[model samples]
Target: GQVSKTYYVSKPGTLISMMTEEEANSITHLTLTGKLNAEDFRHLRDEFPSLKVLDISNAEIKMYSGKAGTYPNGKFYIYMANFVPAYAFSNVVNGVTKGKQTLEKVILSEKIKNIEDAAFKGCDNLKICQIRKKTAPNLLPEALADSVTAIFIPLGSSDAYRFKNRWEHFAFIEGEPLETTIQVGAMGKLEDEIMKAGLQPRDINFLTIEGKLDNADFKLIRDYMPNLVSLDISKTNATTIPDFTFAQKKYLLKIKLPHNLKTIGQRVFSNCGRLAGTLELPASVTAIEFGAFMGCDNLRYVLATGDKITTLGDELFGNGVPSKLIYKK
Candidate 1:
């Protein structure tokens, strides 16, 4: 088996200059750190011919002007800072198809605000694009490969990439955390401790809380952390998902109901239109109260991991939604 030689370029556009002729041609993985420009990108696209994996997580994008490689009006050519220029790694530059064929994966950094038109165009072999941006980077249609098998994004950005873009149909997997924690004994001081951690209560996008959480504590989270898109309270002793527990939470996309959960109170998830994907009821849940899932239309299915649910609530999914209760072994 051929071992992959990983190389690092701490400074931008020095990928070719920093490495030997042998090192540049044979390195299979590259992690770029400094602000990278079009020439730096071209070094990867044109110079380094065999790079398979690219990591730009610690790197930033810089503006540069030379040739309109993707499109030419012959008048203006400016690749803006913090934005990936149109057809940056494009396979077709000037009608000739040759760009990033060997590159398989790309790790986009968090500071990237947008990806201009067809930035990854003709990265034919690319299968995975890992994005660390908590918000979805602005992307145009066909920017990346349509056949891309996996798109790994941070937890909370699901809503933006799912409903708002052409990537709505793409199967998304949560990869990273834009997270804060609720430590033990933090019930009463949830807001204070969150701010002490250098964040506002509303700034929390995902939470992983420990210790016991009663209905009041849960309500505090519901009130204080309004922008939370994902939560994991599995380590807590909270069982019942109290009535109206998360009705006001608009951006909720993922949740980890307590592992020992017994009951789901009335309207716990009612009218939560932004809720998408399958709802997995843990093996501990025994009862679900009236309208438990009412008005949550975006949820596709209820995957019950256990047959412990003996009671069904009225209008459980509002008026005839597509949420099918599927039992899993």
Candidate 2:
């Protein structure tokens, strides 16, 4: 039996007082809205005896400074704005506890952007967790229960989490990205190859351009389809992608770098609003020229897979927004 409740919590630690003991003991699922702090999470873990699933996506995690009844220590500190405190849902949050075994599923909304280390250490019964952020949050190791089947993330956001070294506990899941195939030189023009294939040019959102292609081919697509979200050009023989190639194609998000690519020209993906989740350069890539991704407002991670880069560009991410550079580990 599922006894579920949706609460609009205006304050952080008042959730327990808002419901009765009988309701608290029987509720199988709980949906919290408004503001919540670490105290609310602790009390929900300790008080909700039969709770199975919890959703705090609609709720904002604010600063909470005071004593929580669940803590043996009089003061428990959780002052960060949007990050989950360390060992928050682990076996011993504040010392001497086994955690909430009944908590099978958890959902973290986009409002919460980070999870600290060992947040959910001993909740072995947990099965899945969902995060709705467009970019992968700073998820530390052991933040989620060890054996959860999946960590569902937002669509078109895999590259932010896919290449991470420490993210291995849950199989991250998202809706299958829309995809199609295009073979350059198989027909006549790049547009002809895409148009003759029968899939709509704009509809070929996830296009895989096969065979060797040059800067000219990229221009056709850059001028041809404005709605392309992801392009798999990794199999091509091109060595460099020219300047101003995809500077402002707001819809075209990610272009998989050719495996042998050695150089990236200036302002290639500048001003792209819906560009790649992560700009992962291939292992063979060595030099990236001036302002390659200068004006991108939506870039998340600029992954330099190479252990060494000789010519690092200046103002690489320019004034739009800074994308964190994660060099080879």
Candidate 3:
């Protein structure tokens, strides 16, 4: 048997009060998945100047104001299971907490209530946010930043759908995205190889795919010319998205998948934030990878034609809202 001693961090302000280096370094990058004292978190951020990823999943806190000055060089994921109270969660970055952050993106869970003022005001470099809400209705502009260019809504939650349509600048899709095509198998490969030659896809804003597609070939389309903004893969044979195929291409906004195809990779649409439109997913398929649309904040309506899907992973949408998911019979 092992005897355990508890080193309690009762208050966030304790960071500033400490004169020792060991005490200061302990709180930085703290991933709280159990329970946390909210009153103490208010001042915890001030102590560590180099703190980054703060995941408070399944924890117990109250206030929710730890994102103050510490600039994150990468992505910051905060999952407040039952801690954050009302709009208090929005106060993560307001006023002084604004310009001090160097974070490129953020992922907020659906456990918050009131989205107070200036929650995300000074994050000028922020690219996109995917939010998932179950109970709380997204209201305050400061919570998601009215200036936020991209926001992703899930397949349920009608209230969130209406709110995002009104406040956040979002593009709602009837389903996953209408699949349209131009040719069949061979041509698709030919075009993909030619484009892989690094041909400048200028003035080629819109891409309409017409015919059956192969995953291996379609993967080339996203690989070669990574600057494509609009893509339509409605009638392709891409049953599952390729790995690391579209991770670097963050500029894509619109895409259409096939109806007969099923299953998709997790990072299929990794960091594509500019994609703010309707998504039409055919009902014939089953299963969707985790974080399939993690950083795709611009995602709006998800038109799932079939009722075969049984699993919807957690935190798929960064910090936006879910409009609707219409199932076709």
Candidate 4:
């Protein structure tokens, strides 16, 4: 094992040039906690050429430009964001001149509010980014490199980030970062169980709940599985489907309801932009809450094979559901 030297800065406005070449070359970990100028960054690459880990989570970098910037080498972890200016992580000599970078993972700070265009446009090896803030920051075009595979944001912020401009470029976005995959068999606290198994919520593309589920469970699934294509809750003990049960679920293609489902709450599947084909109500359903299928623009037909339907909520099919689209037996 190679014994690596570590460097630390405790005070602001301290110069990094004080370190000797021998010491800098041996450094593997660098921690900065102070005020830094742009020129200090330029010397990082040339001085600590072998640096593998850098933590600037609490530094206030004053100025930054292409001329005096450090482009670290190899796969490394950078903890940053607070006092750094816009385009701080850009893979450019000057914000416009493209350059090569070997960044692998980045952890962002809560104080960050905005990012400039092309901030990480050309980092081919960049893989993961973690944003710890619950409130999303505004981002410019191409803020993340195309090679980035996954992004982890604050819990419950995946939807806002996924739909935000330029953030959609990544292949997967989740509320948490998991090191391994989990195979889900049953569903009690589905999202919690999945997270506790070292897996992320977005990884669940198809899910089947084997037991009882309520409005809370439905809300959990709705919040966590935005990209879910199919779900099977049939044979479960779900009695009522609440409002906005599957609202804005554009990617959901199919769902199997419980055989004994009694009531469907209001706007249960509202604004399901891509939910198509026939939606067959079960024989045990007695009442359908208002706007149950509201804004299901692509839905083709509704087939019901039941005599127990007792109540039909107002505007149960939204504003434009054609009369011929519904069928009853």
Kindly indicate the candidate among 2 and 3 with the higher TM-score: 2
What lDDT tens digits, residue by residue, belong to model 2 across residues 1-329? 37989999998778888989998899898999988887877778678899888888788888776666233354565546677655566655446557578886778888776787667667765655677776667777777742332466787877776565555433555642235676776334666676677665654545787786787787876676665555788988888888877775654545778988988888887776555367788877778888887766667778988876788788788865454577875
Of 1 and 3, the candidate ahead on TM-score is 1
lDDT of 4 by residue, 1-329 (tens): 13343345443234566677787767665655566643454454335555544445455555433444443322232323333333344444434544225444455556556654555556443445566667556776666653333565776776777777766644444544333223334455656666786656666655666666767778877787776645678867888887787885755656788878888889888886556667887878888888888887767776666888778888877776664235476
Best by TM-score: 1
Error of 4 at 78 (Å): 50
lDDT of 3 by residue, 152-182 (tens): 3355643555454335344322112221234
The candidate, 2 or 3, that scores higher on lDDT is 2
Ranking by TM-score: 1, 2, 4, 3
- Model-by-model lDDT, in order? 0.72, 0.70, 0.48, 0.59
Kindly report which residue stretches of model 3 are placed more than 4 angstroms away from their true locations once superposed. Answer: 1-182, 186-204, 311-314, 318-329
**Model 3 TM-score on a 0 to 1 scale:** 0.39
Better of 3 and 4 by TM-score: 4
| Prediction 1 global C-alpha lDDT | 0.72
lDDT of 2: 0.70
Candidate 4 segments exceeding 4 Å error: 1-188, 324-328
> How much is 199 displaced in model 4, in angstroms?
2.5
What's the true lDDT of residue 226 in model 3? 57
In order of listing, the candidates' clash counts read 0, 0, 35, 1
Q: Lowest summed lDDT over 10 consecutive residues: which window, candidate 4? A: 72-81
Superposition error at 318 for model 4 (Å) = 2.1
Better-scoring candidate (lDDT), 1 or 3: 1
C-alpha root-mean-square deviation, candidate 4: 12.7
